[PDB]
Amino acid sequence: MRVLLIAGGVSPEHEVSLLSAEGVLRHIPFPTDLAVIAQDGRWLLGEKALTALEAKAAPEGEHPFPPPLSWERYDVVFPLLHGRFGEDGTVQGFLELLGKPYVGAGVAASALCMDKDLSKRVLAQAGVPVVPWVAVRKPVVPFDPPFFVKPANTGISRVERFQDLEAALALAFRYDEKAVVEKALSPVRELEVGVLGNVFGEASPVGEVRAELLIPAPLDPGTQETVQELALKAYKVLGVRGMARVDFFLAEGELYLNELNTIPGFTTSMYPRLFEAGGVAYPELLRRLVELALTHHHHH
Amino acid sequence: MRVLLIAGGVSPEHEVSLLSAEGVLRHIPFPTDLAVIAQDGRWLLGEKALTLEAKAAPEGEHPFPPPLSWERYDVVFPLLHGRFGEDGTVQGFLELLGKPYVGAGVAASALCMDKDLSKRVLAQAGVPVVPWVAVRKGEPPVVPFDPPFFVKPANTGSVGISRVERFQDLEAALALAFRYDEKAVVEKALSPVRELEVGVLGNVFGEASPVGEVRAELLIPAPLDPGTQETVQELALKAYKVLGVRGMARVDFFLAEGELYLNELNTIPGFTPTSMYPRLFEAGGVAYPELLRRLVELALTHH
Numbered sequence: 001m002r003v004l005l006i007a008g009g010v011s012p013e014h015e016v017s018l019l020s021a022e023g024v025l026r027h028i029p030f031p032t033d034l035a036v037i038a039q040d041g042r043w044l045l046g047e048k049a050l051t052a053l054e055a056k057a058a059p060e061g062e063h064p065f066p067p068p069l070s071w072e073r074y075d076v077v078f079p080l081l082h083g084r085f086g087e088d089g090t091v092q093g094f095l096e097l098l099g100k101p102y103v104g105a106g107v108a109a110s111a112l113c114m115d116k117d118l119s120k121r122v123l124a125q126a127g128v129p130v131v132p133w134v135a136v137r138k139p140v141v142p143f144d145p146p147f148f149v150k151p152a153n154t155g156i157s158r159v160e161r162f163q164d165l166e167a168a169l170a171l172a173f174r175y176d177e178k179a180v181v182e183k184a185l186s187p188v189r190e191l192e193v194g195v196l197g198n199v200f201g202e203a204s205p206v207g208e209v210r211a212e213l214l215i216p217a218p219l220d221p222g223t224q225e226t227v228q229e230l231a232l233k234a235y236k237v238l239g240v241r242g243m244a245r246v247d248f249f250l251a252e253g254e255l256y257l258n259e260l261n262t263i264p265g266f267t268t269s270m271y272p273r274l275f276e277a278g279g280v281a282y283p284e285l286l287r288r289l290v291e292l293a294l295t296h297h298h299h300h
Numbered sequence: 301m302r303v304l305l306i307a308g309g310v311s312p313e314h315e316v317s318l319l320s321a322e323g324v325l326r327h328i329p330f331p332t333d334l335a336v337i338a339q340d341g342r343w344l345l346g347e348k349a350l351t352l353e354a355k356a357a358p359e360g361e362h363p364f365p366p367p368l369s370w371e372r373y374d375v376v377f378p379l380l381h382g383r384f385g386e387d388g389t390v391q392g393f394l395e396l397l398g399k400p401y402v403g404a405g406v407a408a409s410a411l412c413m414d415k416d417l418s419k420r421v422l423a424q425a426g427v428p429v430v431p432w433v434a435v436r437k438g439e440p441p442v443v444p445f446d447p448p449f450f451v452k453p454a455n456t457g458s459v460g461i462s463r464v465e466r467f468q469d470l471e472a473a474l475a476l477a478f479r480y481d482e483k484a485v486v487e488k489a490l491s492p493v494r495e496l497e498v499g500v501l502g503n504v505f506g507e508a509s510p511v512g513e514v515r516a517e518l519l520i521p522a523p524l525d526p527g528t529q530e531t532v533q534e535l536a537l538k539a540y541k542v543l544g545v546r547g548m549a550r551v552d553f554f555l556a557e558g559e560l561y562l563n564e565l566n567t568i569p570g571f572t573p574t575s576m577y578p579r580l581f582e583a584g585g586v587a588y589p590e591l592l593r594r595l596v597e598l599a600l601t602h603h
C-alpha cells in the first residue's frame with residue numbers, strides 16, 4: 001500500500017495546494033510519495049518535490065507531462081490540487097485512463113462542481129435553493145445591483161453600479177472564458193459542512209466562517225439539519241465521490257447553497273476540523289479517503 | 301501541420317471508431333499519423349496501427365501512456381466513441397499534454413456523456429427532454445411514469461440498454477444497467493417516434509447543419525414542417541451553447557406527436573461513409589475536407 005500525493009498545480013491556488021500537502025503528509029497513515037506540479041506545469045519528483053514543498057512554491061519544474069513515474073507502484077493517487085487542472089476533472093480523467101484509483105470526485109462531478117454556472121443549473125433543477133444568477137460568455141443581467149461577479153471556474157469583484165459591470169467582467173474574464181453574475185447577499189452568514197463517502201455520504205457538524213471558524217455553528221437545530229440534508233442531497237445528485245466541502249449562505253433562515261468544493265483545503269482547515277468535531281481524527285479521515293477510492297475502483 | 305488521429309478504444313464502439321478513422325483519413329487536408337488504442341487498453345503505433353486495415357485490434361503493444369512523440373504533432377484528433385473516448389478522460393490527458401485537440405473539452409465531454417446530468421442541465425435551460433429519472437445502485441427506483449421505458453447506464457454510452465414494457469421487468473433492467481455503471485436512467489419510451497439529427501460546428505457559438513432523419517435510411521434533409529426544423533436548429537445551438545461544447549457535436553432529437561425532445565449530444569460522432577454527421581454538413585455546403593480542416597482550425601483557435 002502506497003499513496004501518490006500530487007500538489008502544486010498551475011492554478012493561482014498553487015501555493016494553497018502545497019500548504020495542504022504538508023498537512024496530509026505528516027498525518028496520512030500510508031507510505032506516501034509526493035509529486036509536485038510546478039507553476040509552469042512541469043513535474044518535480046523525489047527529493048526535489050520535498051524541497052519545493054518546504055519552499056511553499058514551485059515556480060518551475062523539471063519533468064514535462066506525463067512524468068517519469070511507475071504508476072504500478074502506487075495503489076491510490078491523491079490529487080491535492082485546487083482550481084484549474086486538478087479540481088475540474090482533467091487530472092481525474094488522466095488517472096481514469098491510467099486505471100488508477102484516486103481520492104475525490106470523478107471527471108463529471110469535478111467539472112460540474114468547478115463550474116459555477118452549470119452546477120447551479122443542476123442544483124436549481126433538483127430543487128436546491130441557490131442565489132439568482134446569470135451566465136455571461138466572452139451582457140444581460142435581469143436583477144439590480146449589487147452583484148458578485150466571478151469567473152465560472154475558479155477557487156471575484158463586488159459591483160454596486162451597473163456602469164461598474166463591464167469592468168468586473170474583464171477581471172473575471174482574466175481567469176475564464178465564461179463568468180457568472182449573481183445577486184449579492186448582505187448581510188450573510190457563511191455555513192460550511194463536510195461530506196464523506198461515495199455518492200451516499202455522511203455529514204459532519206455544520207461550521208461557520210465569520211478568518212474565524214465556529215465549530216459547531218451557532219444554529220437553531222432544524223436549520224443545521226436542513227444544511228446537512230441539503231449537502232447530502234446535492235452531493236448525491238452530483239454523483240460526488242470521496243469527499244466535498246459544501247458551502248452555504250444564510251440570511252434569516254433563507255439558506256442558499258453557494259458551491260461545492262471537491263478538493264477542500266486540508267491543513268486546521270475547515271473540512272478536517274469539521275470531521276474532527278464529528279469523531280473522525282485527521283489520520284482516520286485520510287485513511288477513509290484512501291479506502292473510499294479503493295472501494296469505488298475495485299468494487300464498483 | 302501534422303495531426304495525430306487516435307482511434308479504436310476499449311469500448312464496444314471500437315470497430316466503428318476504426319471505420320470513422322478511415323473516413324477521416326480519406327480526406328483530411330493535413331499529413332496525419334494514426335495511433336490505435338486496442339481493446340485491451342494498450343496502444344499500437346506506426347504501421348502496426350495502420351495494419352486499421354484489419355478493422356479490429358484485439359491486442360496492443362504499448363501500455364498507457366504510450367512512448368509517443370507528441371512534440372511531432374500540432375493537433376490531436378481523438379476519434380474514440382463512448383467511454384474512455386467521449387467522457388473527458390482522453391481530453392484531460394490531452395489537456396495535461398498541452399496539445400491542442402479536436403472536440404469538446406473535459407467539462408462538456410463528461411457532461412454530454414452523462415445521460416442524467418446533461419438532461420438536468422438542459423431541462424433547467426428550458427430545452428425539452430423526455431421524462432426521465434435517475435436510479436442509483438442500492439436505492440430502489442422511483443418512476444412516476446408508466447411503461448414502456450428505456451433503461452440505460454447513465455454514463456456508459458449501447459450495452460446495458462433495455463426496453464422495459466412491464467413495470468415488473470424494471471428490476472432486471474436495472475440489474476443489467478448496474479453491471480456497467482453505478483447510475484442508470486429510466487426514460488419514457490416514446491411511440492410512435494421519429495429520430496431527428498443535426499450537426500453543430502464551432503466553438504460554443506456554433507452553426508447548425510441541415511436536419512437529418514433515420515427511418516435504416518438517412519433522409520437528408522429530413523422532411524419536416526418548416527417550423528419544426530427551425531426549432532431543431534434553435535434547440536441544437538442553444539444546448540450546444542449552454543453545455544459549452546467546442547469543435548463539433550451531433551445533437552439527436554426525438555419527434556413524437558408534434559413535440560421535440562433532445563435525446564442526447566454526441567461530441568465524437570461517427571465519421572464513416574455511412575455516418576450522419578459528415579453528410580449533414582456536405583448537404584449544408586461544407587465539404588468533408590473543409591469540415592476536418594475547420595475542426596483542426598477550431599482546435600488551434602481555442603488553444
Ligand SMILES: Nc1ncnc2c1ncn2[C@@H]1O[C@H](COP(=O)(O)OP(=O)(O)O)[C@@H](O)[C@H]1O
Binds near residue numbers: 148184185
Ligand atoms: N451572492 C453572494 N452574496 C453574498 N456574498 C457572496 C455571494 N457570492 C459570494 N460571496 C462571498 O464571496 C465569496 C466567494 O466565494 P465562492 O463564490 O465560493 O468562490 P470560490 O469557489 O472561489 O470560493 C464567498 O465565500 C462569500 O463570502
